[PDB]
Amino acid sequence: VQLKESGPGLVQPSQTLSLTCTVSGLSLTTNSVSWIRQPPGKGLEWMGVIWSNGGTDYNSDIKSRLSISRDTSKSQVFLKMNSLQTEDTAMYFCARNFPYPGINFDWGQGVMVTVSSASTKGPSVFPLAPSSKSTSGGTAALGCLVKDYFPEPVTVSWNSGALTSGVHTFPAVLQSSGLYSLSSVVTVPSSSLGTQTYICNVNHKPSNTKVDKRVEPK
Amino acid sequence: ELFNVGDDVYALPGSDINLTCQTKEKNFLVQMQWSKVTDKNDMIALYHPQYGLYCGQEHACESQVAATETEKGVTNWTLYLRNISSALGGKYECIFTLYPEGIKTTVYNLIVE
Amino acid sequence: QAVVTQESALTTLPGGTVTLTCHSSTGAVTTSNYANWIQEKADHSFTAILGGTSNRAPGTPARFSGSLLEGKAALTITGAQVEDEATYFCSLWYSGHLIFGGGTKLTVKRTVAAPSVFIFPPSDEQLKSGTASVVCLLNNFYPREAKVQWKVDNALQSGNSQESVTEQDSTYSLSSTLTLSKADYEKHKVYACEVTHQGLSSPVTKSFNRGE
Ligand SMILES: *[C@@H]1O[C@H](CO)[C@@H](O)[C@H](O)[C@H]1NC(C)=O
């Protein structure tokens, strides 16, 4: 019982998209796996299902491009989609026992797959420095501004796992430049700001960028 | 909804129990199910005539269940419990779901010495 | 094959009970439509709530129940909790094609809380490249509806702002980013972020002065 989707992060309108859903600890012979995708801003779209018994059913709008198959020996379901279009960039989820039997229902985390002829692009990571303008009530705010990357999957952690309370990393936004930008903030007892060092660990794997910027007060 | 005899099996620790359950339905048969209700309602195995076999949580039902068809048209739905321990007792039941609505259950009470 | 519609939005107090339903354009819903409900929060986060009409998914609290009522399938929360404020999508199965409804927006009125507001000047480590990003953060508020306006020397900006909200407290937080060319950043001097929210008596302004 864990579902992990994996696949290419950026694929051009030329290729065929192939993601694979890998399920721990369950045999695909008594579980079914479905693929649901959601392009940003648009609604959910179910794409197809591979049943416990190997049969399949597909969404009638994608049947001609879509192939769902499985390997019961590795406990994996595959999706291959030819004739990639640019809309086909979306969040891709797999869900087990969905819609049927809907008991033991579980929905994976999703993998971002962006379809465009564009180039990989690494972020620029600036500090959102804590300061006098950053204290309410004895607690100061600090953070990182992760700017101008592509395509969408970036991840941020603080003190490489040590910092979790008070960290909210906001969803990225898409600027007219076509590049994403994202903010990650931490609230801390500001009475502590001088003795602690706080540093965000940014990682954008579609561009093999890892960066750490020290957020030091102003 | 509807019930269908079903007995009390009086078993001795270590026995083998073979609970079978038939229905004549085909056209209107949606799924067959094996459940153990004790202080839980615990789904063991769920079979759908087109989508296959699915195991309830915590269970290794693939090896213990079977669905076969008699050529007089009846579907046999069967659950096999091996080497039963004192703990395997309690109320087992077999639930057929029919289209569009009703349910036909058959309840088996396994009492272990 | 059919259109699945759900209530557009619903509200309760904590401890209330609400019933969301899920209507099939094609007639009364049978169990054979295997109605199911997933819950969306921020961040492309989907949690399976309940499937196969009435089966709670692993982990779903006991307040969640599902049923067939009227011509539709129904998810019923009994004793709504503030954590249940979300968007709920239902989906129906039509022998081969799965169609989702549009999703209901369940709001569960927790107690009103005004955002704490912080403002972040552009880093030196950014001006450098010719751009300047000003950042304004609204921390922990309820309800989720907030105004954010950027004033550059008391002059409203348009088209150079982007914001985004997230839920955690089960309160919302918000980050709005203003970006200008370092050229433009330098004729003006008061950079102000202006917040209105139900928790504020009067709109709050956190501002700063370029050097000062
Ligand atoms: C039957 O179960 C008992 C109780 O756990 C076990 O000790 C015994 O080895 C089992 N017998 C066989 C033949 O597997």
XYZ file of C-alpha atoms and ligand atoms in Angstrom:
557
model
C 0.000 0.000 0.000
C 1.783 3.001 -1.433
C 1.289 4.411 -4.927
C 4.051 6.292 -6.676
C 3.734 7.762 -10.141
C 6.910 8.345 -12.156
C 7.583 9.614 -15.658
C 9.231 12.296 -17.766
C 8.847 15.830 -16.484
C 8.914 17.556 -19.867
C 8.191 15.914 -23.196
C 7.865 17.598 -26.527
C 4.711 17.680 -28.734
C 6.621 15.134 -30.822
C 6.817 12.139 -28.438
C 4.584 9.642 -26.776
C 4.204 10.104 -23.037
C 4.997 7.103 -20.886
C 4.434 7.189 -17.119
C 4.447 4.151 -14.880
C 2.503 3.646 -11.640
C 4.249 1.352 -9.144
C 2.322 -0.157 -6.248
C 4.070 -1.548 -3.157
C 2.910 -4.454 -1.386
C -0.083 -5.506 -3.399
C -0.515 -7.793 -6.325
C -2.065 -6.210 -9.380
C -4.082 -9.415 -9.770
C -6.467 -8.423 -6.955
C -6.192 -4.659 -7.492
C -7.171 -2.372 -10.356
C -5.375 0.828 -11.256
C -6.828 3.845 -13.005
C -5.203 6.941 -14.514
C -6.745 10.365 -13.919
C -5.192 13.606 -15.097
C -5.969 17.250 -14.428
C -4.510 20.018 -16.564
C -4.059 23.156 -14.474
C -7.212 25.221 -14.281
C -9.300 22.590 -16.036
C -11.275 19.792 -14.409
C -10.429 16.192 -13.758
C -10.463 13.789 -16.686
C -10.429 10.040 -16.232
C -8.326 8.355 -18.919
C -8.520 4.588 -18.400
C -8.381 1.633 -16.074
C -6.562 -1.709 -15.935
C -8.605 -4.122 -13.862
C -7.353 -6.767 -11.473
C -7.927 -9.310 -14.216
C -5.972 -7.477 -16.937
C -8.938 -6.175 -18.919
C -9.027 -2.473 -19.725
C -11.522 0.349 -20.377
C -10.593 3.770 -21.774
C -12.012 7.233 -21.936
C -13.679 7.481 -25.318
C -11.991 10.807 -26.112
C -8.463 9.342 -25.760
C -9.030 5.656 -26.626
C -7.134 5.967 -29.952
C -3.922 7.369 -28.385
C -3.903 5.616 -25.015
C -2.554 2.210 -23.949
C -2.702 0.884 -20.380
C -0.796 -2.288 -19.545
C 0.741 -3.927 -16.501
C 3.590 -6.161 -15.329
C 2.308 -8.323 -12.482
C 5.834 -9.487 -11.684
C 7.108 -5.969 -10.915
C 3.671 -4.771 -9.612
C 3.470 -1.883 -12.092
C 0.926 -0.360 -14.477
C 2.074 1.606 -17.516
C 0.470 4.380 -19.548
C 1.731 5.299 -22.999
C 0.068 8.102 -24.954
C 1.008 8.872 -28.534
C 0.409 12.096 -30.482
C 1.244 14.329 -27.567
C -0.448 17.641 -27.750
C 0.383 20.742 -25.766
C -2.858 20.563 -23.593
C -1.839 17.152 -22.509
C 0.389 18.827 -19.993
C -1.396 18.119 -16.755
C -1.070 16.539 -13.366
C -1.119 12.741 -13.732
C -2.553 10.628 -10.881
C -3.071 6.931 -10.487
C -5.730 5.573 -8.156
C -6.094 1.962 -7.152
C -9.443 0.166 -7.069
C -11.020 3.194 -8.722
C -13.797 3.454 -9.807
C -14.207 -0.262 -9.187
C -14.410 -1.691 -6.596
C -14.191 1.622 -4.780
C -13.327 -0.315 -1.600
C -9.632 -0.036 -0.631
C -9.937 3.078 -2.674
C -6.719 5.069 -2.688
C -5.436 7.903 -4.901
C -1.733 8.427 -5.513
C 0.129 11.658 -5.266
C 0.474 12.605 -8.914
C 3.339 13.486 -11.232
C 3.592 16.697 -13.244
C 4.108 16.195 -16.980
C 4.544 19.319 -19.118
C 4.276 19.000 -22.920
C 5.958 21.821 -24.800
C 8.733 22.363 -27.341
C 10.376 24.750 -24.821
C 13.715 24.390 -23.073
C 14.542 23.361 -19.522
C 15.215 26.371 -17.298
C 16.664 26.534 -13.795
C 15.347 28.785 -11.006
C 16.857 31.871 -9.407
C 16.590 31.677 -5.600
C 16.541 35.062 -3.685
C 16.098 35.519 0.072
C 12.984 36.990 1.561
C 14.929 38.460 4.453
C 13.441 38.693 7.958
C 13.375 42.194 9.345
C 11.563 44.787 11.437
C 8.788 44.778 8.795
C 8.655 40.995 9.272
C 7.740 40.808 12.982
C 4.175 40.534 14.407
C 3.886 39.658 18.031
C 7.392 38.394 18.723
C 7.676 36.041 15.748
C 9.484 37.057 12.544
C 8.846 35.740 9.047
C 11.484 34.630 6.575
C 11.543 32.843 3.277
C 12.848 32.224 -0.226
C 11.609 33.499 -3.593
C 12.127 30.786 -6.205
C 11.878 32.620 -9.513
C 11.804 31.907 -13.272
C 12.022 28.153 -13.681
C 10.397 25.742 -16.124
C 8.643 23.313 -16.192
C 6.609 23.149 -13.078
C 8.030 20.544 -10.644
C 10.146 22.376 -8.013
C 10.595 21.375 -4.336
C 11.731 23.363 -1.283
C 12.808 22.305 2.192
C 14.316 24.260 5.068
C 17.470 23.142 6.909
C 17.182 19.954 4.848
C 14.350 18.572 6.985
C 15.028 20.217 10.359
C 12.540 23.044 9.730
C 8.898 21.933 9.458
C 6.724 23.968 11.896
C 5.654 27.138 10.445
C 6.811 26.373 6.950
C 4.246 26.915 4.203
C 5.526 26.683 0.615
C 2.908 28.263 -1.647
C 1.852 26.846 -5.026
C 3.806 28.277 -7.893
C 2.306 30.901 -10.143
C 2.709 31.178 -13.934
C 3.960 34.592 -15.040
C 3.369 36.011 -18.508
C 6.990 35.197 -19.207
C 5.784 31.618 -19.153
C 8.056 30.966 -16.174
C 6.938 29.923 -12.728
C 7.738 31.653 -9.473
C 7.117 30.371 -5.984
C 7.515 31.484 -2.393
C 8.382 29.448 0.666
C 8.068 31.026 4.064
C 8.821 30.146 7.658
C 7.611 31.777 10.809
C 10.015 31.559 13.722
C 10.262 32.981 17.207
C 11.999 36.180 16.241
C 13.636 36.152 19.678
C 15.666 33.420 18.142
C 16.560 35.050 14.834
C 20.110 35.985 15.837
C 21.170 32.607 17.178
C 19.590 30.444 14.480
C 20.697 30.216 10.974
C 17.913 29.329 8.527
C 18.535 28.343 4.938
C 16.231 27.036 2.301
C 17.128 24.014 0.156
C 15.618 24.362 -3.296
C 15.688 21.526 -5.832
C 14.478 21.650 -9.456
C 15.322 18.273 -11.002
C 14.115 18.988 -14.607
C 17.156 21.345 -14.764
C 19.472 19.403 -12.396
C 19.647 22.486 -10.157
C 20.093 22.263 -6.417
C 20.625 25.608 -4.644
C 20.717 26.800 -1.029
C 20.393 30.547 -0.089
C 20.991 31.859 3.421
C 18.166 33.966 4.619
C 19.881 36.302 6.968
C 18.163 39.245 8.615
C 18.276 42.807 7.306
C -32.439 -7.849 1.748
C -33.075 -11.561 1.039
C -31.779 -14.672 2.830
C -30.980 -18.179 1.580
C -30.755 -20.871 4.347
C -27.172 -21.370 5.568
C -26.193 -23.361 8.597
C -23.981 -23.608 11.668
C -20.698 -25.357 10.984
C -19.413 -26.948 14.214
C -15.674 -27.273 13.801
C -12.639 -28.360 15.782
C -9.460 -26.294 15.860
C -7.267 -27.278 12.971
C -10.122 -28.276 10.676
C -10.643 -27.127 7.107
C -13.860 -25.284 6.254
C -15.243 -25.106 2.714
C -18.181 -22.661 2.575
C -19.984 -22.681 -0.772
C -22.823 -20.468 -1.943
C -24.705 -20.604 -5.255
C -26.910 -18.316 -7.278
C -28.714 -18.913 -10.544
C -28.470 -15.254 -11.542
C -26.333 -14.263 -14.496
C -28.123 -11.511 -16.317
C -28.657 -9.522 -13.159
C -25.635 -10.616 -11.078
C -23.438 -7.601 -10.276
C -20.915 -8.992 -7.771
C -20.289 -11.730 -5.251
C -18.742 -11.096 -1.886
C -17.409 -12.924 1.146
C -17.604 -11.069 4.460
C -16.797 -11.995 8.024
C -18.923 -10.064 10.504
C -17.855 -10.624 14.116
C -17.669 -7.269 15.862
C -16.523 -5.890 12.528
C -18.117 -6.222 9.169
C -14.929 -7.390 7.408
C -14.926 -7.750 3.612
C -12.750 -10.706 2.589
C -13.214 -11.120 -1.137
C -15.191 -9.296 -3.802
C -15.600 -10.746 -7.311
C -17.096 -8.894 -10.276
C -17.998 -11.003 -13.335
C -16.296 -8.526 -15.689
C -13.755 -6.729 -13.573
C -12.276 -9.631 -11.677
C -11.337 -10.469 -8.129
C -10.530 -7.902 -5.467
C -9.338 -8.611 -1.938
C -10.557 -6.699 1.054
C -8.029 -4.911 3.201
C -5.709 -7.089 5.301
C -6.503 -10.209 3.310
C -4.848 -12.884 1.240
C -8.111 -13.851 -0.393
C -6.787 -14.794 -3.841
C -5.620 -18.175 -2.622
C -8.742 -18.963 -0.601
C -11.663 -18.060 -2.911
C -13.094 -19.277 -6.186
C -15.951 -18.540 -8.539
C -16.899 -21.126 -11.109
C -19.928 -21.756 -13.230
C -22.045 -24.871 -13.497
C -23.219 -25.528 -17.024
C -26.767 -25.755 -15.614
C -26.019 -22.032 -15.344
C -25.461 -21.582 -11.621
C -22.532 -19.608 -10.288
C -20.651 -21.230 -7.406
C -19.028 -18.776 -5.002
C -16.728 -20.482 -2.532
C -14.490 -19.562 0.428
C -11.910 -22.010 1.843
C -10.499 -21.515 5.376
C -7.483 -23.746 6.184
C -6.372 -25.166 9.526
C -8.858 -22.971 11.371
C -7.726 -21.501 14.656
C -9.907 -20.670 17.650
C -10.028 -17.103 16.364
C -11.467 -17.842 12.936
C -14.955 -18.372 14.362
C -17.780 -15.919 13.873
C -20.378 -15.093 11.275
C -19.312 -15.524 7.642
C -21.702 -14.440 4.962
C -21.955 -14.523 1.199
C -23.634 -11.541 -0.434
C -24.791 -11.457 -4.039
C -25.631 -8.019 -5.430
C -28.321 -8.074 -8.104
C -29.287 -5.489 -10.728
C -30.798 -3.061 -10.366
C -31.119 -3.191 -6.668
C -31.585 -6.159 -4.461
C -29.217 -8.272 -2.423
C -29.297 -11.989 -1.662
C -27.179 -13.007 1.349
C -26.499 -16.468 2.825
C -25.125 -16.515 6.378
C -22.743 -19.169 7.791
C -21.949 -19.391 11.500
C -18.580 -21.094 12.123
C -18.363 -22.225 15.765
C -14.973 -23.666 16.758
C -14.660 -25.990 19.757
C -22.774 9.232 -21.689
C -24.347 11.572 -19.141
C -23.584 14.743 -17.174
C -22.827 14.566 -13.467
C -23.748 17.672 -11.475
C -23.191 18.473 -7.803
C -24.238 21.376 -5.609
C -22.091 24.366 -6.450
C -21.459 25.450 -2.838
C -22.578 24.548 0.714
C -21.961 25.950 4.220
C -22.230 24.789 7.808
C -21.230 25.435 11.283
C -18.913 22.993 12.971
C -20.927 20.153 14.412
C -23.547 20.613 11.717
C -24.397 17.981 9.162
C -24.480 18.581 5.417
C -25.318 16.283 2.590
C -23.655 16.736 -0.753
C -25.332 14.929 -3.602
C -24.274 13.851 -7.055
C -26.925 13.776 -9.778
C -26.858 11.583 -12.854
C -28.321 13.110 -16.009
C -29.305 9.621 -17.111
C -31.730 8.602 -14.363
C -31.693 7.365 -10.804
C -28.241 6.225 -9.643
C -27.868 2.509 -8.995
C -25.091 0.973 -6.962
C -23.781 -0.092 -10.357
C -22.641 3.508 -10.964
C -20.135 2.976 -8.085
C -20.383 6.631 -7.018
C -17.321 7.937 -5.254
C -16.035 11.079 -3.662
C -12.597 12.552 -3.536
C -11.691 15.654 -1.593
C -9.490 18.398 -3.001
C -7.629 20.883 -0.867
C -4.752 23.090 -1.939
C -1.858 22.151 -4.098
C -3.294 19.404 -6.409
C -4.099 17.392 -3.286
C -6.697 14.677 -3.679
C -7.757 12.371 -0.864
C -10.067 9.488 -1.511
C -12.985 10.024 0.818
C -15.462 7.293 -0.046
C -16.040 4.895 -2.924
C -18.448 2.269 -4.159
C -21.397 4.418 -2.970
C -21.028 3.743 0.783
C -17.533 2.387 1.561
C -15.310 4.773 3.491
C -11.773 4.802 2.074
C -8.791 3.848 4.305
C -8.394 6.713 6.777
C -11.654 8.493 6.205
C -13.247 9.643 9.487
C -16.489 8.142 10.695
C -18.425 11.335 10.124
C -18.248 10.553 6.401
C -21.094 8.423 5.155
C -22.451 7.784 1.692
C -25.851 6.669 0.491
C -28.315 6.678 -2.373
C -31.014 9.277 -1.668
C -33.494 10.745 -4.149
C -32.387 10.164 -7.662
C -28.752 10.746 -6.772
C -25.814 9.493 -4.742
C -25.100 11.373 -1.561
C -22.108 11.987 0.674
C -23.159 13.042 4.162
C -20.791 14.482 6.753
C -22.279 14.201 10.246
C -20.661 16.619 12.648
C -18.693 18.677 10.153
C -15.313 19.750 11.451
C -13.328 22.774 10.377
C -10.832 20.436 8.659
C -13.568 19.350 6.269
C -13.677 22.706 4.481
C -12.692 21.654 0.989
C -13.909 21.037 -2.521
C -15.505 17.615 -2.991
C -15.709 15.933 -6.382
C -17.999 13.025 -7.055
C -17.711 10.756 -10.038
C -20.038 8.210 -11.621
C -19.384 5.060 -13.667
C -21.340 4.398 -16.860
C -20.187 0.918 -17.890
C -16.821 1.933 -19.356
C -16.637 5.714 -18.941
C -16.095 7.552 -15.687
C -17.563 11.044 -15.553
C -16.808 13.495 -12.741
C -19.156 16.121 -11.393
C -18.032 19.678 -11.096
C -17.198 19.564 -7.409
C -18.956 21.119 -4.438
C -17.301 23.846 -2.396
C -18.033 23.010 1.226
C -17.259 25.866 3.565
C -17.325 25.187 7.307
C -17.430 28.474 9.188
C -14.666 28.412 11.752
C -14.133 31.513 13.882
C -13.072 34.727 12.116
C -9.348 35.421 12.205
C -7.524 38.398 10.773
C -4.277 37.825 8.875
C -0.964 38.883 10.301
C 0.749 40.826 7.486
C 4.449 40.940 6.574
C 6.245 42.685 3.686
C 9.501 41.640 2.017
C 11.688 44.083 0.042
C 13.582 42.910 -3.043
C 16.864 41.304 -2.213
C 20.136 42.853 -3.252
C 20.820 39.590 -4.681
C 17.906 40.238 -7.182
C 18.118 43.987 -8.046
C 21.405 43.178 -9.597
C 19.666 41.350 -12.461
C 17.480 44.370 -13.282
C 14.279 43.042 -11.700
C 12.832 43.783 -8.289
C 10.270 41.589 -6.547
C 8.357 42.888 -3.531
C 6.678 40.196 -1.478
C 3.686 40.532 0.820
C 2.495 37.680 3.033
C -0.842 37.315 4.841
C -0.501 34.712 7.577
C -3.247 32.501 9.051
C -6.667 34.013 8.383
C -10.272 32.971 8.037
C -12.329 33.261 5.901
C -10.219 32.655 2.835
C -11.475 35.797 1.076
C -8.953 38.527 1.274
C -8.135 41.604 -0.704
C -4.480 42.444 -1.488
C -3.614 45.798 -3.210
C -0.143 47.083 -4.083
C 0.388 50.821 -3.778
C 3.538 52.364 -5.188
C 3.559 55.847 -3.711
C -0.170 55.393 -3.115
C -0.619 54.524 -6.822
C -2.418 51.288 -7.581
C -0.554 48.726 -9.685
C -2.146 46.464 -12.288
C -0.815 43.427 -14.122
C 2.495 43.137 -12.266
C 1.058 41.209 -9.314
C 0.558 37.512 -8.741
C -0.862 35.829 -5.647
C -1.752 32.362 -4.386
C -3.470 31.013 -1.255
C -2.872 27.800 0.640
C -4.625 26.093 3.547
C -2.850 24.281 6.347
C -5.184 25.610 12.157
C -7.186 24.952 8.954
C -6.622 28.635 8.228
C -5.423 30.188 5.030
C -2.146 31.888 4.199
C -1.422 34.102 1.218
C 1.619 35.376 -0.694
C 1.430 38.173 -3.288
C 4.460 39.160 -5.372
C 5.023 42.500 -7.081
C 7.764 42.590 -9.745
C 9.161 45.678 -11.492
C 12.173 46.510 -13.607
C 14.973 47.888 -11.433
C 14.690 50.988 -13.587
C 11.044 51.501 -12.612
C 11.687 50.378 -9.023
C 13.947 53.365 -8.507
C 11.732 56.417 -9.228
C 9.406 55.426 -6.437
C 9.997 55.189 -2.800
C 7.051 54.039 -0.660
C 6.235 50.415 -1.419
C 2.999 49.412 0.236
C 0.926 46.245 0.620
C -2.689 46.889 1.660
C -4.816 44.155 3.300
C -8.638 44.058 3.946
C -10.179 41.069 5.551
C -13.192 40.378 7.734
C -10.837 40.154 10.683
C -9.604 43.738 10.206
C -11.594 46.715 11.456
C -9.843 48.912 8.848
C -7.598 47.798 5.981
C -4.065 47.288 7.134
C -1.062 48.654 5.289
C 2.424 47.257 5.666
C 4.808 49.408 3.641
C 8.460 50.245 3.315
C 10.759 52.982 2.059
C 13.473 51.989 -0.440
C 16.584 52.860 1.550
C 14.949 53.620 4.923
C -2.080 -25.216 12.031
O -2.062 -24.018 12.834
C -1.344 -24.185 14.060
C -1.618 -22.967 14.912
O -0.864 -21.848 14.468
C 0.123 -24.389 13.720
O 0.878 -24.515 14.920
C 0.257 -25.657 12.888
O 1.609 -25.837 12.483
C -0.643 -25.608 11.648
N -0.619 -26.891 10.963
C -0.177 -27.043 9.710
C -0.209 -28.439 9.166
O 0.224 -26.095 9.041
